[PDB]
């Protein structure tokens, strides 16, 4: 933001600033099941004969 020669003098940064990183990360939500967590195990007699 402090830089005033961003494209007028061709000061194109080759690294994306942490502020932009935080903005872009916070823009979109997170997939809840994107996290892996299990302790019960695998449904040997289910998890495949579910509802249609």
């Amino acid at each position: 933001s402090h830089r005033r020669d961003y494209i007028r003098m061709g000061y194109i940064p080759r690294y994306t600033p942490w502020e932009w990183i935080a903005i872009q990360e916070a823009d979109q939500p997170l997939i809840a099941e994107q996290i892996r967590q299990d302790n019960i195990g695998t449904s040997y007699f289910f998890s495949l004969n579910r509802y249609w």
Partner: peptide, 12 residues
């Protein structure tokens, strides 16, 4: 203020 130019970053 220098970090508030675009948006608030702590919301992440």
């Amino acid at each position: 203020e220098p970090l508030q130019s675009f948006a608030n970053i702590n919301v992440v």
